[model samples]
Target: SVKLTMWIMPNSDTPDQDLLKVVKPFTDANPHITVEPTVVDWSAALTKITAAATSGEAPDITQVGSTWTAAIGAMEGALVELTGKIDTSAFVESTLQSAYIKGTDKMFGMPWFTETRALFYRKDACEKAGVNPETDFATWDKFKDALKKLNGIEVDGKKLAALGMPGKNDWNVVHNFSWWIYGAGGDFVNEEGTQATFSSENALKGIKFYSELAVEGLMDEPSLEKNTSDIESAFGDGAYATAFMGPWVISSYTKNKEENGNDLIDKIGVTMVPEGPAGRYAFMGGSNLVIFNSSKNKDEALELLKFFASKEAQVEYSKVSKMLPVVKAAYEDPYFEDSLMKVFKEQVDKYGKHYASVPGWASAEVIFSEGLSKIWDNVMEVDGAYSYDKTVQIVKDVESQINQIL
Candidate 1:
């Protein structure tokens, strides 16, 4: 029997049971191949996967974030090149691009699912503020007005914020900041991925907008020290009327509502990020399935991957997991035709953009994040200001560091 080992990341959408169900058909069709699957916690998966790659003990198939395409596939040479082995027509072009190294023709992985950030707002709060979430939040100026009104809302004598912004030191500081960067028509790296463009006019516009959230008091005061989970909890508690989050938040927040009987779930609505002068854009994120070059069963591993990519299998997984499907045809399914999912799907199709996929990107993330932390900490102080000079100085320093690494 040909045995293939798969290491999957722990996903809220695709639970072990649901994954097993999805895999059952594949195994039944290919009786000679027995698939073994293990779920790895996000905290430990990267460390262990890296160790396995170094020691030549990696699983035949593993799930990795799309951002890791360069780190693992191009730099470490841990993943197999899949340029001609798989059918590419059915996949989203941008998503497929995530697994490709620029200036090269090699494909590293297959995108299993794709996601983009959106504005998750509470309808109840919008109504109370006399704001029309649809039209009032369609553009930046209108959205700003709605936010000012939402900030005035009080529940149980506790003030509610318009948006739940990420804290200074969290990794989400970068992810959250990306939406504004994209919305402002800025990118972290140039088209060639060799230089830092974080100091570009559009980029600084984004940085300034994000920083102004603190100055304007549109976000919770304590949010400077909070993380994504903290922000989610606050959202559920009515501390914020809106948040920028991905599709997974839908399921997670629904569960939160169920546990506390919070009617916030019923009042929840989603929309594309408000339009800026440049355009509406979002932070694109999700995982890809890659076959490690260290595997002995490459043929079987490839077969299993194809099974996972099949329209039937992808649809089934989406039905169970509530994750957006990578196959365009899967969007035709009734499950994705819902109002909330339709908005998210459109964002992924149109406005989704990713960080530069290149060597040293993972390390650059650290440098960029630290710079943001310093800038936010200093400017968010009681007497401090989110001044343009300060923003430019910090950005130049960070951009220099990124250029050195690249």
Candidate 2:
């Protein structure tokens, strides 16, 4: 039997053995090939994958974050090019684009699943605040109005804020800012993917929206210091009325409900994210499956991709993981009709956006995070009164930093 090793990042909701279930059928059919799968902790994925690449010994198949997938593909031609091999049209448009090397048509990843941020609100809180979740928060202006009204409400003895904003300098902050930038019709890199455009007027306006939230006390300000986990906990305990977060959070909230008998699962409501003056958008995140060019069992690895990408496998994996499936055909199943999942499925299919997959993305994240950190500190230190001049200067500085790296 041919042996093929695969490395996958752990899914919070689905056990590794359950994920392997999708592969069992394939293995049974191809008895001559044995598949060994390792579930790696995400925090160590970069270091481990990089080490494997540098040593020229990558796994035959591996799961990588969309943010770094293309870069790794271009780094040393470490990934197999699947440009015409797979059904590109099957994936959500933004995700398909994200798997390609920036400014080129080379594809290195096949999307397995994707996650996008959406408006997660507490239905009870919105009702008590006299705000309608369906219509009142439909536009940016209306969303802001609702936030102002929901700011001081009390729910279950905890004071509530309209949204939970990430204040720390991290991926969450970068993603939060990116959503606004895209919603305002701005982008991180120019068409050539060799320069930064974050200092554009549209980008500034997006940052201003985040600043206004802090200034007006419309979001859980102190929770800004909280990372994703902390924010999820606060949201679960009824401390925040709404927040823009990913579908994986549903797993967290569901677990909370099961363990503590909290009504959080029932109270939480999801809807399409509100639109900005330009349009509505959300960042597409999560992992993709890639085959390394170094694999000896190339044919078997390719077969694995075909099996996993099939609608049946995709639907089964998504049903268990709670993450949205990449296959468009997979949504036809009634499973996606679940109240909460339907919202996410619609948002991801219709409005998902992704960052440029340039080789300099790693550096860009740092540059963007540092500049945003300064802006957040300036806004909060002055009680939400950030000068436009300062915001412009910071964006310009980060843009320059990014350009130099590119």
Candidate 3:
């Protein structure tokens, strides 16, 4: 008999309870194995996981943010290889990329649940500005026009902004910009994942366009000082015309009447992220379950992994977490009907994109975020005036450093 311990970050308010409910069937079927789950806050999980990994006391099963997998897996003797144990062919290529490190046959994590970003606009705000989220947000050129129209419009005594997103202050700063990099026909690295290309010609085109939104005074200036939670809540509070987000935003907008006075849940309109010169590509990221090499009960841990990847577990967890399932078969459930969330599913099915799963990406992402924040800093110093040369140079500087790490 084995008492398997696990760690996970919160996806819902009642993280532990909801997780227990989702795994009840598994525990029932495997009576000899009892499970204990702990919830960790995303802000501090990395430090704690790092400490555990170094101390050789990590749990048998732990959830690692998909983007964090490469960094954690790089640590010698930290994670167990799952190349033969896990079915790599079962998951889609975008979500599957992070499971194994670049240029290596070794596997690190198993794809669990996945999520992607899209456009979420307030219909009322767009109406006041004479912009249509559906058509205007179809491509970069049209999106700029829509933003210009919605830039300074007032709605119900409140100034509605064209867009809102976090600056360098957020942990996901790199992820938020992933779509733009890909949309401009640039990738973070070469296909072999041996070098950084953040400052490449096409990549700069999209990156500059994104910065131009802020330079043109379309985005809420204060938002650049805030983080993701602040921006998500602000969008629902009727402060912005639109936001780029994932299905998880449903929770952010469905708060109590006091928090969401505009009744934004019903007024929200969603669409795939705007297309660019390259195409409508968006970041696809989520958590993956990994087994620590310290775990003595490896056999039982693998069993838990098997059940979690099963269609039943994937679909059930998807319902509770409001994230798309990584397993292909989970989509067959009627629960995945065309509704408000159809936009997310469509983008993943059609234009899913991901970062190069190289060991250096974790550090490279931090450097990229820091440099991106500098662009905003430059804009803030001026009167919201943007400089393509300045932005390009910032990325170029970042590229030089990232190349060394990659």
Candidate 4:
């Protein structure tokens, strides 16, 4: 029997169970294959995966963060080149952007699942604020108005803040800030990847708009010091009325049971990020499934991957794990066609943009986040105020570091 070892990252609260459910059909169809899975935590996945890639002793299948494609591709022969092995045209082009080796069009793997952020607002709070969340989230001015009215909403005499968002000290800094950068018509680097562009006039608007939300008391103040998990936890506990959230939040909320057997999931409603000056976009990110070149059972591994890319697996996994499907036809399924997820599916089809397909992007992301952290810390120092000069200086320094990486 051919036993293929798979390494997967956490996608839902019950990652192992969710994966086994999705993998059962594949194994049943290929009776000669027995599959094994190892779950890796996000914190240590990078160093561990890097060690395996460099040593050429990798698992048969490794689920890698989409953003690290450049770095993984840079590790020569770590992953099987799939240019002609798989049907690439079946996947979303945006999701496939990060599947290539930097400066070249060599394919590495197929997109597993994709994610995009939208406003997760409380239904009760919007009602109290006299805001129609359905129509009020289309533009920045309207969004601000909704937030203003949503702030300090009295529910059973307890006031709630308008929103919650993680500031810095998180891995998703580049993703959390990307929509704003693109909304302002700015990018992290120029098209040719020759220079840094985050310090430009348009990019500065991205920085200012995001920081000042906390500065102006429109956002939960303590959230600035919290990480994504903490911020989302507080939002679930009703500490805030709205939050910038991804599909994972859906699983977290729906699976949560209250003492009275009622879930907070029913109170949540999703809406698009408001339009910016240049138009709006969603951050395109998720994991990709790659076969290790060292795997002895290459054919079996490839077949398992194809099963995962099938329409049935896409719909089943997406419904249970609360992730967006990579296949365009999966969007036509009744599950996504008439669900809150349609909001994300709509954005992915139209406004989703992935990171620059440039070399050294992972290291550059670290440099960029530190500068954003500095801006967030300063907001605390000045008592809810933003400083344009401070932001520019930090952006300039961070841009220089990224330029060095390129």
Highest-lDDT candidate: 3
Structural similarity to truth (TM-score) of each candidate: 0.92, 0.91, 0.93, 0.95
How much is the lDDT of residue 147 in candidate 3?
87
Q: In angstroms, how far off is 15's CA in candidate 1?
A: 3.9
Q: How displaced is residue 122 in candidate 2, in Å?
A: 0.4
**Model 4 ranges with Cα > 4 A deviation:** 258-260, 382-386
How many steric clashes does model 1 contain?
0
Candidate 3 residue-wise lDDT, 150-189, digit = tens: 8878888877788988774556778888889899999888
Worst 10-residue stretch by lDDT in candidate 3? Answer: 251-260
What local distance difference test score does each model get?
Answer: 0.79, 0.81, 0.83, 0.82
TM-score, cand. 3 vs. native: 0.93
Query: Distance from true position, residue 296, model 1, in Å?
Result: 1.8
What is the number of backbone collisions in each predicted candidate, taken in the order shown? 0, 1, 0, 0
Candidate 4 C-alpha lDDT tens digits along 119-235: 899998888889898889888778887889988879645799898888757677677889988988899888876688899999988878877777788988778888888887788
| Regions more than 4 Å wrong, model 1 | 1-3, 43-45, 168-171, 257-260, 382-388
- Candidate 2 has which clashing residue pairs, if any? 167-224
Query: Candidate 1: lDDT of 337?
Result: 77
